[PDB]
Design a protein around this ligand. Sequence first.
Ligand SMILES: [Mg+2]
Ligand SMILES: [Zn+2]
Ligand SMILES: [Zn+2]
Ligand SMILES: [Zn+2]
Lengths: 143, 35, 184, 48, 103, 96, 1260
Amino acid sequence: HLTQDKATVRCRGKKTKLIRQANEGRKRGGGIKFGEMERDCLIAHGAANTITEVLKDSEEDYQDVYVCENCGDIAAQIKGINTCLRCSKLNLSPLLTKIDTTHVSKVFLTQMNARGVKVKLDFERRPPSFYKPLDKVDLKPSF
Amino acid sequence: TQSIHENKEITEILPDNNPSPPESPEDRNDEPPED
Amino acid sequence: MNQYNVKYLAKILCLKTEIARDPYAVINRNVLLRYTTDIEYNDLVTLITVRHKIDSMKTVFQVFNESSINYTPVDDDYGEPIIITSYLQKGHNKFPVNFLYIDVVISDLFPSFVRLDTTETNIVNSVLQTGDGKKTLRLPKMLETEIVVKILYRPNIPLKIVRFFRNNMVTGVEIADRSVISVA
Amino acid sequence: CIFHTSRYPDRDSMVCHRILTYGKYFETLAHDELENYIGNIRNDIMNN
Amino acid sequence: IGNHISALKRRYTRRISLFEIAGIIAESYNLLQRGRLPLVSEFSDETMKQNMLHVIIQEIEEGSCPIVIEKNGELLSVNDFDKDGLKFHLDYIIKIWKLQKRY
Amino acid sequence: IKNIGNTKSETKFESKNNIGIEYSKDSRNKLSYRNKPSIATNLEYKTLCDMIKGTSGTEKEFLRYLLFGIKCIKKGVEYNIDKIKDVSYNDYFNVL
Amino acid sequence: AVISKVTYSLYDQKEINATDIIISHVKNDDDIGTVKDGRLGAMDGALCKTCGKTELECFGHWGKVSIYKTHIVKPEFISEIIRLLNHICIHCGLLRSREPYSDDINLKELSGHALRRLKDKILSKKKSCWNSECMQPYQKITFSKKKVCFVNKLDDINVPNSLIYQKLISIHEKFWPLLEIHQYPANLFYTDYFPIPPLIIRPAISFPKETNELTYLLGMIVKNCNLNADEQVIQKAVIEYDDIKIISNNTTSINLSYITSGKNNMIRSYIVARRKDQTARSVIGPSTSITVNEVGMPAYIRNTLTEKIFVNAFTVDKVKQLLASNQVKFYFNKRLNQLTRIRQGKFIKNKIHLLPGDWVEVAVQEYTSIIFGRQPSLHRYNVIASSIRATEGDTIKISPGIANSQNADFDGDEEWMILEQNPKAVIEQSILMYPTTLLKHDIHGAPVYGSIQDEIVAAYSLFRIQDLCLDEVLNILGKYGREFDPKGKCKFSGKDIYTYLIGEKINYPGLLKDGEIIANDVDSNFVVAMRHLSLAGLLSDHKSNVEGINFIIKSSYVFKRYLSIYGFGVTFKDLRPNSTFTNKLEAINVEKIELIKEAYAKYLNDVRDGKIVPLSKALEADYVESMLSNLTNLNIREIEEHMRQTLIDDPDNNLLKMAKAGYKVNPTELMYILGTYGQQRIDGEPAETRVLGRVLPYYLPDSKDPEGRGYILNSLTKGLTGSQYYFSMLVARSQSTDIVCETSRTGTLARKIIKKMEDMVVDGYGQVVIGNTLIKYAANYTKILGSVCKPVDLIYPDESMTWYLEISALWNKIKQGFVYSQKQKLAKKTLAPFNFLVFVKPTTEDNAIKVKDLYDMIHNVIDDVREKYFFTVSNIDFMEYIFLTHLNPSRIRITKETAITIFEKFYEKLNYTLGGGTPIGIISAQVLSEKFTQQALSSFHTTEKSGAVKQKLGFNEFNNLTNLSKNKTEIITLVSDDISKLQSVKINFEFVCLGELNPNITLRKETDKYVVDIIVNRLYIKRAEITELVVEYMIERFISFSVIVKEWGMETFIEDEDNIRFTVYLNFVEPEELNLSKFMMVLPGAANKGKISKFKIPISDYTGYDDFNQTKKLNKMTVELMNLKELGSFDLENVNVYPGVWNTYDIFGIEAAREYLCEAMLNTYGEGFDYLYQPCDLLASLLCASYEPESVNKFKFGAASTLKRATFGDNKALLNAALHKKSEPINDNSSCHFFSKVPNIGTGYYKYFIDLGLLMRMER
Ligand SMILES: [Mg+2]
Ligand SMILES: [Zn+2]
Ligand SMILES: [Zn+2]
Ligand SMILES: [Zn+2]
């Protein structure tokens, strides 16, 4: 058992085609897997942003994707215009909204749509809020 | 050893040996029926 | 109804007497130290006389089997027959045989419980609110058919929350609350 | 063995087993293949 | 009697722990790193030669931190929490930062 | 002793007693009504006429224990298992 | 722009039809019109013919195929259809009742009980059609599973899907609530077109690229569509395309359901886990130049990993300089989302424009925080973020101070690293995951970092060295000796060095006084992690974690300097200077074993003749075991005396130094090395005999020799023999195999527990809640951080104390819970809020605070805190009791300043420690899981043999408790003080058979009768604890009801003073001899009484508590029962009864069940693990959160989300949600991870805004 036969490091490389994540194989320059036990540990620290950014796609792979609020289909872009083909065929004008999710999520939802299950997403439209001055509070004991 | 607060002692459970990390994978009717 | 489970039921019909006297008392084993009981057994109607030591006041319960019920009030009657049933059923005076296979009240597993008054109820309700509008939390649940609910019953005081004094190994006593949900 | 089970050779005992060496693998395979060969010849002749 | 408990809970809302101050610092640091305008006093060309964490701490201390946090149905700026707890947590954080060569 | 039974609801018995034990667990092997004795015996006693009928409670147990005691007294034995002495084996296993 | 609600449902047919891409052919010139045409999306080197975009920007489009009048069933809902056919008459299509068809009843203003009862009646009708329209019998339709079609059980007749569809669609909407139909029956079939999914989910398989399996199945479907074939062909093709397992039983074919097949889901292998880009892994090693806050990184990793620098007003010039120096590796243009690999002289400088918001990536720099850890990650401390330090070699270097917290060593272990550079993540790593913040363990509060191995010995030695000059003291101290103060002395001791290291004047009962050590010696409990006497723990309690970490670092440094100066080593002459002691002990063993053998032989020979009745097998084994145990204890005592004598003669023995310091050496290990090896056991008993009543052929058949069944006489120095070696290896190999199996099982249980408790947190008022339910009013009973609370002695009331009446009253108020475990344990400890004992200093009785003033201060503070921080609900009498007893003026006098300081620290802990969003539930789950896993893998628990029913220890019992399986036997315990009530139950329940009494049955035949004689010796009857008439009753009862006996009679005779003869006269039924043989075969075991079971029912005694000063003697017995019905006629008055979980739930209620669960789960762990009480109390409180107990394998009462169930491993939750049309919010961790949202945990528990008011009030 020799050290240099076990060393491994990755910065950037190839991806798996179906899900678009780092590939596998030390001889193929694959990455190390972040398991869900490590995810539990990070949640035990209370570091929400760290795990949120760990499980997300690289910020350098962002792109604009729209979704139809009526049926949940990824709106296509025809001649530069966002359009939901299914709802347009039915003479409807649904709202198209931007989302920021992982590719594997889209693959999973599409495959679930294949089996016949329709998945619909709503979005939060909370009314605006305003800051108000607050009186002071001490909280120390009377000693 | 000595005893001071034995009623609050904490016991240690840590295996001495653990498994090394995994390496890269890299009819003649001549048998019993076994019912 | 046989000659043994009546001696177990006579203990429950002292907690019921206590609650009749004071609807906001705390109920546990120690209450039995303030009462005495006399039992007269029979295969048709059993008579249980409960006596409060300091006051010397009597309460007489008549115990029947579910099949045959022949109830007529007598002196110092509790005002309602006590019935032993084959299965668990709704009603504060109906007890299944399942409850009387052993001496229940004196077991170490019998709870300690009380009914909250109006002020304490308001305090609990206020404490449960989340402070964001009217959203509120909920207390855990307990069925309406438990023996605890049967013991704590008054005709003109609906029961919604019950407070338990749990045994705690490190702090001695702890306080918890439960909400009573109806059974159809 | 019905009445004294613990005194009868257990199924995992080495008392009631035998072991295959290199030669026996080849011997068994030759047996099986020869039988399959003759069976196929018989079926072909019958069909013809 | 509900008013009394409501007042006690409102006062209880003002205590501060590590999670909240860490979140506030994280938000402010992210926005500043990605290029917002610092809101310190005496802002000038010299302000850009300091350390960004010094800038964030100064903004907090002088009461010009733009982050607003929602805790119990209310909206609090970093100066509406109890002052002593803020000092307590900031002292700890600055010590450990100095150990890391950040401050 | 009162009627406590068993039903087919792990145990390691001697395998010579286990056959009967597992045979007794099947209710199909028992008559629905008791089969009274039909061969005369114990001709030198009349208490059997008393126990065999009528007495069907603690009185029956008392009478049969009395009968056993009377037999023992006639034979000339202690008739009280508590008052018999049990051999002590610590005389063999007290070494060391 | 925030996802807040997710709804599931089934597509409408018109929605499926709303597409202009029609698939018709299985082949074509350019795939046009096939299942592979480009309009569905892009493919390798081909733009999408619909939107004209490449693969990276096209997510596919939907198509359809035409089916000619052939209605198709959706596979997953096939079963659903069957459920709907049992509520209507197939022939006439009407409900199977008539009440719903009544105008007198309106279903709108009724729900729940009424609808359920009506549905029950409709289902239970199950009779020939009531209505005369068809007046036909009701059929029973089922899917064949061999033919892809519905068939009737009565008649093997295929039922076409068109008929079923027509019948189902006819049901009116108003009756849906009765049938639990939510959207439409028609949505369960395809009628005019079948959808064809986009190309996104079925790319060509590469390694010529092979065809994708889903594409192949879709093509197979299409092949049978245009053919205008029967419904069976299309249906089978659809089923094998969707879910082959519906009909077949092979679990290797790929279809749609493959994503949710089993443990290899898509969610639990790519959504809540993944592979990353900035990662590394390598072997680890030790380094003395790295502190617990830092980690050393090899060069080969530093030259590959890169870190991000953002472009803003502060850093722009530095970025320009870096570009000038050829140090930038990557550049990201944020306004174009474009990444460029800035080369070294192989790129453009103009391509860079450095606008704000961009960033550049350079080689990783020192003191950057990096996340790293070791696997398996059992608890919080396996993954931490530390500062980078450059080092040599190709190994990741760590400080030995963190080795235990990770369970790591340097025999070949490896560790992994990841680097996240998002600014929020950077801040959170710097604060929350910093080792200095994790010093004190979450549950029991002890430090998690400390010394190890030889350092311990050094510590022990340093405290004992006596005559040192100043130069030697400074040589030991090293770089920490600058501030040493040689006040006026010329000779120094090790106590002086320790006093200098502890730079504080604090008192703690036992260890310290005025900052000086007053204990006799320094041992492992002082300087090792997780111990209860650590000095770093006291320093942290006094001021803060920074001081604790400083003490750890400094003390480790000086310990290693002591090792460098003086050295340490164990030699062979320390263990065995000569052969005197070993020879003596060997001769002693040789004599004693032979004495035991002679005693056994004498007993056997006496039994072999008619002198004594033999013992039972169990008793004989017990006697032999007792003799052997006596010998083993004799060897133990010899070893202890030898240790003492050697310590007297040779005080500088390194081995005895290790023994004294408390490291790995004790009398038992030395007994193994020099004394005897003792009895070897498997499952708590010696090895079993196998062929000739023996184990090995080195002993004669039916051998009684103890050495031949696993008692080893030799020691390791002597050397074991072949057979002793066999027994030893038997034990070893059994241990290893059990370890493997437990390693498999514990992981599954741990994952289930973690998933269940993961979403339990502390809200903004210090309460423990899950979802929308209140679990506990006060988080840790104190609303203080768990690692700050401190266990402390419990001082019972006494008349010599000052405020005696008040203390006795408080005790009478809170004493109920201090006597537990069936009244045989009295609590010794309570929980104080913050370890005030380091702040207490005695004073001289005149400078002290007055008694009345101190009492008033305590009382007023407690009342204030009771109303202001616990809102008048909780009970905190224990805090007041602790303060009144630990500061009692009859015990100690203190100044006013000391009291004020104590209470100010109290308020600080109440105000600044515990905050909302704390992940308490998951921390508890991890603690429990790690504990039972580590206990399982180190063989901590050892099996034992018992004669009475007992509850077991270890992982298996905990798993049984969590599962909550029904319909099993429960271990009911009965305790009393009048033993007659127990004796009656024992006599009526303990199992005895005639064969157990060793009878002497004989049979003979006489004219017209068979005579059977049964001769029984009285001693066996006495040992069985019965009477002769019990045996007579057993025999008579068996014979009377027998079905193979015709005529019978019985009699009894007294053979002599020690025998009884039962005589039976018999005549069997025909056939005669067959029944005779059967009777003689079954007699010994069929004459019995009691409940069948493998355990006897002995009655024991123990002393129980009524209070702290009241004691009683109680009798106890245990028995296994399904329920308590049998007990209903036994006069158990004043008998304490402890049943199992389901019986106690049925009788007492849900609170009693919760208490039972908590106590039993805690007991499964062992003896010295009281601190685990708080975690268990949470887990139990979770299981009994509803009105009934709920297992950990099912989401029955909890309103778990569909994605939560799917991530737990349901595999069918999504389909049911679609069927029922469930609409859910997004709050769980699983739901948030799915949609890339921030969990409501820790920093994410709050919502953040930005206030633009000030910015808009500034003007240029
Ligand atoms: Mg290792
Ligand atoms: Zn749409
Ligand atoms: Zn496209
Ligand atoms: Zn009909």
